[PDB]
Coordinates of C-alpha atoms and ligand atoms in Angstrom, one line a residue:
X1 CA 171.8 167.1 72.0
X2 CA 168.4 168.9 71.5
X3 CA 167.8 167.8 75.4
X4 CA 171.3 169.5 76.5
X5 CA 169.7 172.7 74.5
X6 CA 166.7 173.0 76.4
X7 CA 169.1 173.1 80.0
X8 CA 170.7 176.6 78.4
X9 CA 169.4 179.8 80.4
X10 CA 170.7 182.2 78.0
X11 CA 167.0 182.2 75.6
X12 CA 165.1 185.5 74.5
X13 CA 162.3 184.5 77.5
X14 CA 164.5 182.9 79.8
X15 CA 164.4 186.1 81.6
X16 CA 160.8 187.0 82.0
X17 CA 160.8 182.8 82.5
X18 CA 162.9 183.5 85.5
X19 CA 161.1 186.5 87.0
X20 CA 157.7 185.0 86.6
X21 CA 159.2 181.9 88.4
X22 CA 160.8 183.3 91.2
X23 CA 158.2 186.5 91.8
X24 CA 154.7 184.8 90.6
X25 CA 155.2 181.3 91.6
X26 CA 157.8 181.8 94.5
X27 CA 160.1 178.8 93.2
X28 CA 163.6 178.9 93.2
X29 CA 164.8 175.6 91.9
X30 CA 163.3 173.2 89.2
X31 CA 163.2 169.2 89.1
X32 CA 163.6 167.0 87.3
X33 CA 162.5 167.9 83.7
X34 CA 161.1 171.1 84.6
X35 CA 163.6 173.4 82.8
X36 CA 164.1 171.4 79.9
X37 CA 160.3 171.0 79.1
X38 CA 159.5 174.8 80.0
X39 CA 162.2 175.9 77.3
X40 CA 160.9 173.4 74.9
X41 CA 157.4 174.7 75.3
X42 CA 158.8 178.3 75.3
X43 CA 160.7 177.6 71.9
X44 CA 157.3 176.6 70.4
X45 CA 158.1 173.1 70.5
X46 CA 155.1 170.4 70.8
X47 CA 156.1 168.7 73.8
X48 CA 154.8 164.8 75.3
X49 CA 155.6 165.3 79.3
X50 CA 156.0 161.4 81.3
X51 CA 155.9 162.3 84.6
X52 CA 154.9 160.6 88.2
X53 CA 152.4 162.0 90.5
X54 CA 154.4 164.7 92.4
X55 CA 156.7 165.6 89.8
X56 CA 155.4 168.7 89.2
X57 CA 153.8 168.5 85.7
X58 CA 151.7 171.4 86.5
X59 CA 154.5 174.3 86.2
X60 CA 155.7 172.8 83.0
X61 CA 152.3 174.8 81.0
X62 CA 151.8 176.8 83.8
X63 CA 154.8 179.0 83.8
X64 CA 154.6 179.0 80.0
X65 CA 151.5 180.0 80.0
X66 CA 152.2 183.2 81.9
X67 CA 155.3 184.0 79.8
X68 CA 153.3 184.1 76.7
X69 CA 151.0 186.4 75.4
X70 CA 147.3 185.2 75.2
X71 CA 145.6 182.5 76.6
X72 CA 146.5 178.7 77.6
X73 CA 143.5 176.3 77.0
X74 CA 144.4 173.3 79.2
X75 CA 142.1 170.2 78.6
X76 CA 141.5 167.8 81.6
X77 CA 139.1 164.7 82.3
X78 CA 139.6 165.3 85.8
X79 CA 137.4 167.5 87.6
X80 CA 139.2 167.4 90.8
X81 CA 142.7 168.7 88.6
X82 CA 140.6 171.7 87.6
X83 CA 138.8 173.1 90.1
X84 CA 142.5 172.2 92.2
X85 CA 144.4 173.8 89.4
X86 CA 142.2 177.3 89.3
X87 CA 142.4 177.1 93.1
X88 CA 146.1 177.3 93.2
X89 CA 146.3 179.8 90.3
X90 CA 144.0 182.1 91.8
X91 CA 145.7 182.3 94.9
X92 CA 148.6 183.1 93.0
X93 CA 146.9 186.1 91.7
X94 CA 147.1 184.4 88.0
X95 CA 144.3 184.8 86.2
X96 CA 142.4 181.4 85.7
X97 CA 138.7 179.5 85.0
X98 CA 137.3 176.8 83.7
X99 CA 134.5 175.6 81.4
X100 CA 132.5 172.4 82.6
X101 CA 129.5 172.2 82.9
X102 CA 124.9 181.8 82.1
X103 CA 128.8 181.9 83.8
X104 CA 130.3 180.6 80.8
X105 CA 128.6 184.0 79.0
X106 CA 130.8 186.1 81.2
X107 CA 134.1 184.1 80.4
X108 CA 133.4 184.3 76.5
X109 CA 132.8 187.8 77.3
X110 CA 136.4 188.5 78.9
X111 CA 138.3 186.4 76.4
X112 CA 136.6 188.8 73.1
X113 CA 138.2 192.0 75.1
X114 CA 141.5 193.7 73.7
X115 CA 143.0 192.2 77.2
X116 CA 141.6 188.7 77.5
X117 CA 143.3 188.7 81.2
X118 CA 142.7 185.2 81.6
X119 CA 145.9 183.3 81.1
X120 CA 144.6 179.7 81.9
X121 CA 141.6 178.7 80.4
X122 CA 140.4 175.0 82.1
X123 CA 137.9 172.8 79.7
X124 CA 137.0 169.2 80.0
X125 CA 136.9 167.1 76.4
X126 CA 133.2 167.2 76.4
X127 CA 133.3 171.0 76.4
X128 CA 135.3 171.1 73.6
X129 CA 134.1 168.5 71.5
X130 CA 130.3 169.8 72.2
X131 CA 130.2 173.9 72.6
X132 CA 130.5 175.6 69.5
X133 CA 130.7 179.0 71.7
X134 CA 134.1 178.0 73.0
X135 CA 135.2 176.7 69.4
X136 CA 134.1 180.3 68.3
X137 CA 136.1 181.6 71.0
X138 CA 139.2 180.3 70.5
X139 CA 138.4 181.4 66.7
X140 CA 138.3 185.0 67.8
X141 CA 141.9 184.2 70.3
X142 CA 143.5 182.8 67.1
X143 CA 143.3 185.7 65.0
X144 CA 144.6 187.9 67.3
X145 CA 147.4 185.6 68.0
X146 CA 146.2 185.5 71.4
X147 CA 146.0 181.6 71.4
X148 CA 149.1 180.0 73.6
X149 CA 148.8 176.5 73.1
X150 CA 147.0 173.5 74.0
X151 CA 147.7 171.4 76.9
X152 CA 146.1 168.1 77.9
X153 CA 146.9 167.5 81.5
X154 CA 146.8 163.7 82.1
X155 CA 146.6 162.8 78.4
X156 CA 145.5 158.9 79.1
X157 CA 140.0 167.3 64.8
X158 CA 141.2 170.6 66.3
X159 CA 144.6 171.1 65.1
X160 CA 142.6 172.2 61.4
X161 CA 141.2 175.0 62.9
X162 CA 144.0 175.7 64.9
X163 CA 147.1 174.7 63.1
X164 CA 149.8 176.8 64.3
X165 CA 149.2 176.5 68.3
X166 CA 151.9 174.0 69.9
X167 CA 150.9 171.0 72.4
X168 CA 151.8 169.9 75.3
X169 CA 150.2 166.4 76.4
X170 CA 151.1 165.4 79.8
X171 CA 150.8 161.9 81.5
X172 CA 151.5 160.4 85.1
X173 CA 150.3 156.7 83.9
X174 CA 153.1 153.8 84.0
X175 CA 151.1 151.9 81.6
X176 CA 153.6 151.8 78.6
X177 CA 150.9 151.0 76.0
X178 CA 149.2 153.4 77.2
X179 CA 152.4 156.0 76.7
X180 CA 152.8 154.3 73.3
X181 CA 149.5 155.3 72.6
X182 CA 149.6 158.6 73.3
X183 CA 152.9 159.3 71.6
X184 CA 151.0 157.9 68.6
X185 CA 148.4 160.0 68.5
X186 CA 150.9 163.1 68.4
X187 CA 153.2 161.4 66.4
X188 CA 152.3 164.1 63.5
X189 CA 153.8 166.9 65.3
X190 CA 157.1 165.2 66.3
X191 CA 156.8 166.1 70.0
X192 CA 160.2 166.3 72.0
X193 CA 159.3 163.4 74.2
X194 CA 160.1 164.0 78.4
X195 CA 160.4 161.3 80.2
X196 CA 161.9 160.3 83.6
X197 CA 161.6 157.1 86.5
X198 CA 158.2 156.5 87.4
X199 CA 159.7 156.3 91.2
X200 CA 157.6 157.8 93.6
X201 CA 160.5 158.8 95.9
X202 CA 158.3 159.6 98.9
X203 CA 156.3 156.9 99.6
X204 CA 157.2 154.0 101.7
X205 CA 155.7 150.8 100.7
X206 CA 154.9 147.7 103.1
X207 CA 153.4 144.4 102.8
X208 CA 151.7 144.0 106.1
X209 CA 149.7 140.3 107.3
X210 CA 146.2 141.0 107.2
X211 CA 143.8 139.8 109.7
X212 CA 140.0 138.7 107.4
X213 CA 138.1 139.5 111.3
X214 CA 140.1 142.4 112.8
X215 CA 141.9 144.8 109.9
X216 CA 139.6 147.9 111.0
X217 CA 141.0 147.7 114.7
X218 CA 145.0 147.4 113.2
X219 CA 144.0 150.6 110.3
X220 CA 143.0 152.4 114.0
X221 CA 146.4 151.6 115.9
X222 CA 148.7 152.0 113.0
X223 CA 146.7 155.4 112.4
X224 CA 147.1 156.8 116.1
X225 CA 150.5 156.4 116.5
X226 CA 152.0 157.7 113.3
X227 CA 149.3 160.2 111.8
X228 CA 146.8 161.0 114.3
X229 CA 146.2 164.4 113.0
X230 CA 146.8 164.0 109.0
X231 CA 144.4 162.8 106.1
X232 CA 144.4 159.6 104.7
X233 CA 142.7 157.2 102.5
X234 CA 141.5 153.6 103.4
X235 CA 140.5 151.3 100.5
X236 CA 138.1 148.5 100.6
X237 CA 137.1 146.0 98.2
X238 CA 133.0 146.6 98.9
X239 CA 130.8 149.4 99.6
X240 CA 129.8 147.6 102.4
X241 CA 133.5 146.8 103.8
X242 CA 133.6 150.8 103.1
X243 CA 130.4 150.6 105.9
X244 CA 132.1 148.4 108.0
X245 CA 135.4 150.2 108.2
X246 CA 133.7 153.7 108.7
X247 CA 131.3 152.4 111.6
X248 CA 134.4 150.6 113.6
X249 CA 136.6 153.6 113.2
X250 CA 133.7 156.0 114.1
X251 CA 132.9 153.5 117.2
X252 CA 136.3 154.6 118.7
X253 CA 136.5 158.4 117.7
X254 CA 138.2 158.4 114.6
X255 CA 136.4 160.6 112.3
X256 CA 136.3 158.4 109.2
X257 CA 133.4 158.3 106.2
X258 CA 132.3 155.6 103.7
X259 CA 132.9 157.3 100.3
X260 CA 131.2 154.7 97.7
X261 CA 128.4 154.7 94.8
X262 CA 126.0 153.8 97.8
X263 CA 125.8 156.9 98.9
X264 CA 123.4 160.0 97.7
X265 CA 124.7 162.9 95.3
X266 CA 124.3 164.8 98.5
X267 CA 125.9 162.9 101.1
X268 CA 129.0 162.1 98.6
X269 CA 129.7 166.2 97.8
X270 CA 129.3 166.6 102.0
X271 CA 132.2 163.6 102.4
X272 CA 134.3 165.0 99.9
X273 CA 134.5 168.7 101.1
X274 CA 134.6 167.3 105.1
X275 CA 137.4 165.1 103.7
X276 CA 139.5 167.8 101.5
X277 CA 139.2 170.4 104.1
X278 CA 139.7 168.3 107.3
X279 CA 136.5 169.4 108.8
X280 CA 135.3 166.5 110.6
X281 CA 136.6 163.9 108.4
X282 CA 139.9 162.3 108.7
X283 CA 139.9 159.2 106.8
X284 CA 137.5 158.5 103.8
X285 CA 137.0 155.1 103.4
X286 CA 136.5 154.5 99.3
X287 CA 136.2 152.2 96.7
X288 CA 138.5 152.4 93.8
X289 CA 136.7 154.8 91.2
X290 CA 135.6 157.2 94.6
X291 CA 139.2 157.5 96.1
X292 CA 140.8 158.5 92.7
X293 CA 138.4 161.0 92.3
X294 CA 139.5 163.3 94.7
X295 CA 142.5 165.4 94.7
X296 CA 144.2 166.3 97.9
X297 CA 148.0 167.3 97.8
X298 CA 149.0 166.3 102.1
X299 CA 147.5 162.9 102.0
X300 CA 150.5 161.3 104.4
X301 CA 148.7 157.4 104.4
X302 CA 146.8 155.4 102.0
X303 CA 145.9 151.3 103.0
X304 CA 144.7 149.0 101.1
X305 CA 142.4 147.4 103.6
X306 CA 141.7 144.3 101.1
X307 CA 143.9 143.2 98.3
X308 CA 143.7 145.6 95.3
X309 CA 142.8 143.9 91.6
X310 CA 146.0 144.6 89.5
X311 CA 149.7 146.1 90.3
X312 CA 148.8 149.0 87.6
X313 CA 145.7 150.0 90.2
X314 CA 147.6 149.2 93.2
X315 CA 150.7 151.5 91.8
X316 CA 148.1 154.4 91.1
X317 CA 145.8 154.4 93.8
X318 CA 148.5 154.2 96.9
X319 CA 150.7 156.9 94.3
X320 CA 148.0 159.9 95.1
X321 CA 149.4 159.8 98.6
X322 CA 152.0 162.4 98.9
X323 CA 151.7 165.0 95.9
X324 CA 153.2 167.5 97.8
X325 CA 156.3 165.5 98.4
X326 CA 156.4 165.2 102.1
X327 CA 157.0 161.3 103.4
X328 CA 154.1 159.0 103.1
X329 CA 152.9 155.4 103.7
X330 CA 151.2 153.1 101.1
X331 CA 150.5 149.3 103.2
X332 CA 149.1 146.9 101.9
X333 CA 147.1 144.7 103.9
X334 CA 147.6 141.1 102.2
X335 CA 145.7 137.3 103.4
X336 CA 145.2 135.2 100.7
X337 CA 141.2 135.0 101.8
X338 CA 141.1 138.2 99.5
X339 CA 142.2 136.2 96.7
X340 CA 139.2 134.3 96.9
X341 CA 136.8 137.0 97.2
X342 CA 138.1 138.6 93.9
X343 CA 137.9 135.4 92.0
X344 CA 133.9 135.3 93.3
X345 CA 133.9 139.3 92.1
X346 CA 135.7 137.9 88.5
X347 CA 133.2 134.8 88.5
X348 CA 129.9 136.6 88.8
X349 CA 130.6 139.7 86.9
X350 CA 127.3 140.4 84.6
X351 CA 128.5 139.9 80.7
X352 CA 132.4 138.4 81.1
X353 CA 133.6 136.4 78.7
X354 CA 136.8 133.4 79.4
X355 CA 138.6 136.3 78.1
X356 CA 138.0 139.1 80.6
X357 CA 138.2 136.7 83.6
X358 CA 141.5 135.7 82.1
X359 CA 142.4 139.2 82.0
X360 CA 141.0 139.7 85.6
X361 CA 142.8 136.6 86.6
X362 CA 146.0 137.2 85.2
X363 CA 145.9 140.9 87.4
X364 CA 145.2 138.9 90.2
X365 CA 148.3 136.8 90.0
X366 CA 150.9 139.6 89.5
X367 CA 149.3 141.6 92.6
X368 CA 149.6 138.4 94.7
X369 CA 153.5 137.4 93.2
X370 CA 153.9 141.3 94.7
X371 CA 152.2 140.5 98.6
X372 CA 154.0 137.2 98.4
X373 CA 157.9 138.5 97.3
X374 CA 159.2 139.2 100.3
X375 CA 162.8 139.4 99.6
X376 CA 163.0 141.9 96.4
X377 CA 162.5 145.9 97.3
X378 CA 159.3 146.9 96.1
X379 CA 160.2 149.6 94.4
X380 CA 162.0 147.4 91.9
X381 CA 158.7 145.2 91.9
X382 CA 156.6 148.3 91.2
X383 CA 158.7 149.5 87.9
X384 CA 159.5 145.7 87.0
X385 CA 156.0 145.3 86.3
X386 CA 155.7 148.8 84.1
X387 CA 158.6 147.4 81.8
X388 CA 160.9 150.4 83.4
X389 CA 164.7 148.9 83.3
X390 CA 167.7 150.8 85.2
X391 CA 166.3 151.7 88.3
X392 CA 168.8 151.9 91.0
X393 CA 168.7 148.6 94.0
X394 CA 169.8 150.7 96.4
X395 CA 167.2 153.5 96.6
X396 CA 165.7 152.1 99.7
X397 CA 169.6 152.0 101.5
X398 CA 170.4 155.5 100.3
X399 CA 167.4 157.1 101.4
X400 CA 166.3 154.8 104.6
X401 CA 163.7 157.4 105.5
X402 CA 161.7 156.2 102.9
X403 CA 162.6 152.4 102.5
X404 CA 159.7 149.8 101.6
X405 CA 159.8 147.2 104.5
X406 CA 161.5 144.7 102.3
X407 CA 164.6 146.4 102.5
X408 CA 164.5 147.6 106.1
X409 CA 164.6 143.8 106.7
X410 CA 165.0 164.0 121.3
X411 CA 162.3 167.1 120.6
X412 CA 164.2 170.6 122.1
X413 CA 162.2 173.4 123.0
X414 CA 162.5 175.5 119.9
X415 CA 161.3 172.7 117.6
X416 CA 158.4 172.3 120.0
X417 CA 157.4 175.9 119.3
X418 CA 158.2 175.4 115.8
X419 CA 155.1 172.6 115.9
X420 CA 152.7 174.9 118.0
X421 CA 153.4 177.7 115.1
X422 CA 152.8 175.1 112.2
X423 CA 149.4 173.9 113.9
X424 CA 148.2 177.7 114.1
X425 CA 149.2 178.5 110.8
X426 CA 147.3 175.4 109.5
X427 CA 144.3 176.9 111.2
X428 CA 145.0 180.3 109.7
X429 CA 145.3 178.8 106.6
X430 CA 141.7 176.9 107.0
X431 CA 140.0 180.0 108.0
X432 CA 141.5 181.8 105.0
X433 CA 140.3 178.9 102.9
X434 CA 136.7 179.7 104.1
X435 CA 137.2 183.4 103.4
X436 CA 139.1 183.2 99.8
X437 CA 136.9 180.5 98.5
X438 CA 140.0 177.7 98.3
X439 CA 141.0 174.7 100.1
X440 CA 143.4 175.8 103.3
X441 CA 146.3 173.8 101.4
X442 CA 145.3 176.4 98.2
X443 CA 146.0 179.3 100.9
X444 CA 150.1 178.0 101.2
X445 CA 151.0 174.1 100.9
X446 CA 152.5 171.5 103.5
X447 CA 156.0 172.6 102.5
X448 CA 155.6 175.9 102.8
X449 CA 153.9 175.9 105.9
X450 CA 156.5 173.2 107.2
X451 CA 159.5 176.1 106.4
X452 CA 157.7 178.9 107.4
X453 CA 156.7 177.6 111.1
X454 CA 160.5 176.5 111.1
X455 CA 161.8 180.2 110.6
X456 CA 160.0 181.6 113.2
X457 CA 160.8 185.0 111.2
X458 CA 157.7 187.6 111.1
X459 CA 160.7 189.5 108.8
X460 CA 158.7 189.9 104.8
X461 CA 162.6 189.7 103.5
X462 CA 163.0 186.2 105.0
X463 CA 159.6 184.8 104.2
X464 CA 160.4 185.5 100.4
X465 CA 163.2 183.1 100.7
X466 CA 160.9 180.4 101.2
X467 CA 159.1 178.3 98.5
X468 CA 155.8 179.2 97.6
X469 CA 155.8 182.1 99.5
X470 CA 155.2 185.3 97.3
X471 CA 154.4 189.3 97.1
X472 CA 150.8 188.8 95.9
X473 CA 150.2 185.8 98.3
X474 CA 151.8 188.3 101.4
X475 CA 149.6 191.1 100.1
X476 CA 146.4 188.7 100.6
X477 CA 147.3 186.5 103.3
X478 CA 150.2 188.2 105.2
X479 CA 148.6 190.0 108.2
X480 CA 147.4 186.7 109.1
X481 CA 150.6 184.8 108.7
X482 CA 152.7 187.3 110.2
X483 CA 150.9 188.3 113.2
X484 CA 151.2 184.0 114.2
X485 CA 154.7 184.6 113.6
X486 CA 155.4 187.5 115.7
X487 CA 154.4 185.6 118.9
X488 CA 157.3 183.6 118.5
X489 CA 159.8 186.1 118.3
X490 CA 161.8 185.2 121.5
X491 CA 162.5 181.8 119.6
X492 CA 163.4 183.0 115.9
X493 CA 167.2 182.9 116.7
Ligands
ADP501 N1 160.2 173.4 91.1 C1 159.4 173.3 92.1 N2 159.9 173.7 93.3 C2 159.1 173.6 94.4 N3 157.9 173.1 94.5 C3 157.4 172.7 93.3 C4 158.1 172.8 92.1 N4 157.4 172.2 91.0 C5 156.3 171.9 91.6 N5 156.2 172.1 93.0 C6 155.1 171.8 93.9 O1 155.1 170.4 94.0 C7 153.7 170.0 94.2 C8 153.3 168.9 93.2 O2 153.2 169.6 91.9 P1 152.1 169.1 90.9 O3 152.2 170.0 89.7 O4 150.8 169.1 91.6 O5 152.6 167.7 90.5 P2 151.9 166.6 89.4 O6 150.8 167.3 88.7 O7 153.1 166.2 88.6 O8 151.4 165.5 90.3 C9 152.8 171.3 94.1 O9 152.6 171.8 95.4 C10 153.8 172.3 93.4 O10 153.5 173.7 93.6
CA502 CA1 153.4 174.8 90.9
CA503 CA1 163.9 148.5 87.6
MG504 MG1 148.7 167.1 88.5
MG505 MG1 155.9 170.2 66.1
ZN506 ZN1 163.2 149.0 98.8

């Protein structure tokens, strides 16, 4: 009943809600939860946000927080979801920064002005818990009533100074201890909880039969014939099966780097920004901790070249693929030889106890029941594991573009010029990138790309139909765009 409230458009800011979405962001419809959690947020509510990768979690504070008067502080251990996040906002011409870790100086500076402009303030929980600057900061915000709320985006002592500024914790981990967790922690402020399927509806999942003495040459295939130009993400159970893969891939012209702990602070920041940008680095071929540190919203594959140490890891690590929605592929790469090598891992690691190998042992056998269930869709088997009841068995029949391979068991000439305009507004949007300071897909995103290549229109009044696509972004960006678009004109119609 309070959920059916927060659907209503007829609010005090559902209007300046509205035009901020539509003219700022360039959105026209919201998913799942969006609306409801945006009200709830704009009603002053404290709010606890469950949402998968993709979802769209990031417009739930952010179009709050450009409603409101004052400043949203957003909290994030993730240093890849902030410098991503300011990215995007800046392009959007919405005033953003961060504090991380003499530039911090000229940020307190802005906020203390009778217009503190900034309208999302990025800080990671060190920063707050350790610089009394900010903490005097967001003093000087408070009494001004210039102080949003606070948002912690991926939420897996400072509501006394600040008692009256709502919440808004946000999580994409299936863990439900973990979201039990959390919830307590808020508990206090009786958040209206948001939650939804942990599904990630894009991502096609196989099980494929792995080869211990030729997987790099079946990654290379698999990879030429269905992405040969997109990103993607190979992981490996070793830095030096990261070595391996890299070299045999590199052997044959694929442009793929070893992203590990082995590597030098300065060869690591190199093989992140080559990967990110697509500047002479397709693949990045990672350990665990390494992949999930980097953020990029169009990666279309991720393999598990060995077997991966839990379902909960597995379930995150392939679930980065995709944030941008577009179809991707997670496969796993399963021989029981892998098994064995993560017992030896479980069995010689330094200061384990019967207890953690049981643990480690006991992850072990649910990713193997996973590679060895054949029959059941692995969807199902994904949000079995995560305790999530009621999902519907015929996902995978209803949508057979993006069936898991347990259930699975012509080109005309206008869309061919619809591809040539895509691949040079991609480039457009890489050499922006350079210019603007931003990653190319911080310039416009995959989808918007995708729809704007398939209008063919150099006409403004048609672009701004088209999501993501805005007035500021046109202003910046739109002699570029628009003079790719005009060379198509004989096939717009
Ligand atoms: N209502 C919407 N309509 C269209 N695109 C949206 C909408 N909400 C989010 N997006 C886009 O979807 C992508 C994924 O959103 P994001 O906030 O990064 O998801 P999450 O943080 O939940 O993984 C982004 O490119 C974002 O701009
Ligand atoms: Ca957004
Ligand atoms: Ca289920
Ligand atoms: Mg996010
Ligand atoms: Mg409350
Ligand atoms: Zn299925």
């Amino acid at each position: 009943l309070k959920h059916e409230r927060f659907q209503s458009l007829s609010f005090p800011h559902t209007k300046e809600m509205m035009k901020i979405f539509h003219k700022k962001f360039g959105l026209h419809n919201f998913r799942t939860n969006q609306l409801e959690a945006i009200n709830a947020a704009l009603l002053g509510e404290d709010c606890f946000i469950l949402m998968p990768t993709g979802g769209g979690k990031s417009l739930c504070y952010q179009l709050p927080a450009c409603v409101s008067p004052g400043v949203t502080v957003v909290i994030s251990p993730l240093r890849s979801l902030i410098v991503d996040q300011v990215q995007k906002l800046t392009s959007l011409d919405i005033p953003a920064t961060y504090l991380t870790g003499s530039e911090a100086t000229n940020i307190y500076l802005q906020l203390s002005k009778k217009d503190p402009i900034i309208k999302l303030l990025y800080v990671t929980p060190e920063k707050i818990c350790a610089s009394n600057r900010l903490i005097s900061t967001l003093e000087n915000l408070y009494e001004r009533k210039l102080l949003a709320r606070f948002v912690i985006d991926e939420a897996h002592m400072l509501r006394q100074k600040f008692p009256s500024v709502p919440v808004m914790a946000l999580t994409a981990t299936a863990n439900p201890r973990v979201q039990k967790d959390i919830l307590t922690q808020l508990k206090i402020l009786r958040p209206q909880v948001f939650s939804m399927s942990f599904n990630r509806h894009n991502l096609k999942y196989y099980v494929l039969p792995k080869k211990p003495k030729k997987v790099a040459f079946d990654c290379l295939e698999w990879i030429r014939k269905h992405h040969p130009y997109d990103s993607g993400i190979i992981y490996c159970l070793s830095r030096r099966e990261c070595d391996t893969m890299a070299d045999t891939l590199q052997r044959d012209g694929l442009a793929a780097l070893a992203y590990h702990a082995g590597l030098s602070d300065s060869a690591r920041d190199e093989v992140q920004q080559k990967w990110i940008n697509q500047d002479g680095c397709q693949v990045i071929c990672a350990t665990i901790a390494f992949g999930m540190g980097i953020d990029k919203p169009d990666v279309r594959f991720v393999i598990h070249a060995s077997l991966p140490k839990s379902v909960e890891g597995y379930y995150q690590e392939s679930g980065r693929a995709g944030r941008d929605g577009e179809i991707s592929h997670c496969l796993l790469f399963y021989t029981y030889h892998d098994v064995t090598r993560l017992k030896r891992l479980i069995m010689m690691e330094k200061d384990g106890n019967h207890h953690t190998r049981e643990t480690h042992f006991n992850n072990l056998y649910s990713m193997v029941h996973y590679c060895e269930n054949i029959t059941e869709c692995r969807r199902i088997q994904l949000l079995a594991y995560f305790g999530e009841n009621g999902f519907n068995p015929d996902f995978c029949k209803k949508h057979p573009d993006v069936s898991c391979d347990n259930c699975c068991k012509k080109v005309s000439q206008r869309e061919e010029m619809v591809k040539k305009c895509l691949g040079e507004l991609t480039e457009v949007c890489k050499s922006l990138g350079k210019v603007f300071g931003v990653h190319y897909f911080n310039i416009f995103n995959t989808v918007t790309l995708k729809k704007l290549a398939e209008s063919l229109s150099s006409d403004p009044e048609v672009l701004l139909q088209i999501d993501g696509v805005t007035e500021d972004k046109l202003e910046k960006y739109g002699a570029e765009v628009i003079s790719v678009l005009q060379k198509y004109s004989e096939w717009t119609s």
